[PDB]
Symmetry: C3
Subunit: 168 residues, 3 copies
């Protein structure tokens, strides 16, 4: 569930969805309508992590932060399956593609897209409305704004209404 | 070992399948006979169905999900390597998705084909039967011998169902 | 912690094993080591060794194939969501987050595998060197990473004061 490390307690909005098997630990803030999915890990100890309103952190993703590099997810952000966002700033409407890695100090602009499996080097800026892909990542072109966040606001509310464990 | 019902979608898991501790099979999922879903793996079907074929192993930390119009359909004797992501794609009989790889919506992995470890298979890419695809992004490179992971995991799963116990 | 047949993990009392981590089978976990949330350390057909003071971070995966033991040396860091498979990682080294290290590969002393890099089977990363790319390429000498001392201290803090809310 939700874990207090020493005296650091996650602050989770009651409309947020924390899936079974997800771990929210320590200095973490999870906003209204946010969702953290199965097997995801959100840990804030040496530095804080913010999951803005309506931001979804999909299955197997990992959020963490280093001193001086807080992990700040803006509102209506999507962190795809198995992505790692570490000490970076992701602004409103952006998408971190599934399997991608965003490193410390990187900055994902509004409605920007980090391609699947791309590795964003430390400090790199992804401008607003642009697609960055590759290993290492590189700004390629303008890209249409992702629509994953409204999908996951609604999918999360359905999960909050009808999720039941069943034994076999 | 438990499984998760989303709305009216309960996973249909064959009795000979092995579902490991820490694995999360959610919603519209079929898990075939002799299949195995290993520790920390997530197989989630809600927006669209997901099928784990018979004798198919979904290894540790792997993530399966499907998008509208893109079912995630794993054929028989398929291997999804450690920490891979197969999203809304078709994987034909005997193929291998290398560990850490990502396979995106609409991709098709031909029979006995191999996705290289860490490779990212773009949406809609077709990997022909018996071929090898690797790189970021993935490219079909050469013909490769059929992998033999699925038989070994059928047997390893059977050993786990008989002698896996929690300790202190 | 899970036993597989006759294979029981041997975990030192000072090691931190976070909730949601899965240590399975023929696994050694040394003094002052830590296995964090969602990580999977599985040893069945071959042995895995997590050396003293070595941290296996969140969602990382360790496994081994016959003849390829996964041997993590002391003071080693396996970053978030990394995969180290049947490889040898020497003292002080760093496997960057999201990276993949495959069978028979050797990560030299204080070497660094960059984040998301894929070290092919059998490849050697020499001591004090950085490897990047997919596949991996030895790029330049790098200063010793300092993650292992920080995580030794963080793990002892987590062993003492971690409670579900
Ligand atoms: Zn970290
Ligand atoms: Zn998805
Ligand atoms: Zn393996």
């Amino acid at each position: 569930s939700v874990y207090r490390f020493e005296d650091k307690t996650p602050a989770v909005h009651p409309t947020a969805f924390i899936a079974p098997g997800a771990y929210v630990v320590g200095a973490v803030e999870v906003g209204e309508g946010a969702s953290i999915w199965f097997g995801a890990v959100v840990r804030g100890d040496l530095e804080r992590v913010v999951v803005g309103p309506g931001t979804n952190v999909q299955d197997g993703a990992v959020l963490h932060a280093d001193p001086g590099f807080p992990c700040l997810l803006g509102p209506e952000v999507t962190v795809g399956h198995r992505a790692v966002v570490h000490g970076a700033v992701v602004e409103e409407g952006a998408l971190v593609g599934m399997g991608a890695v965003v490193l410390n100090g990187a900055r994902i602009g509004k409605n920007a897209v980090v391609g699947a499996g791309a590795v964003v080097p430390p400090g790199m800026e992804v401008p607003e409305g642009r697609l960055a892909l590759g290993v290492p990542a590189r700004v390629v072109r303008p890209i249409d704004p992702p629509g994953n966040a409204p999908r996951y606001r609604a999918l999360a509310e359905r999960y909050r209404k009808a999720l039941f464990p069943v034994a076999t």
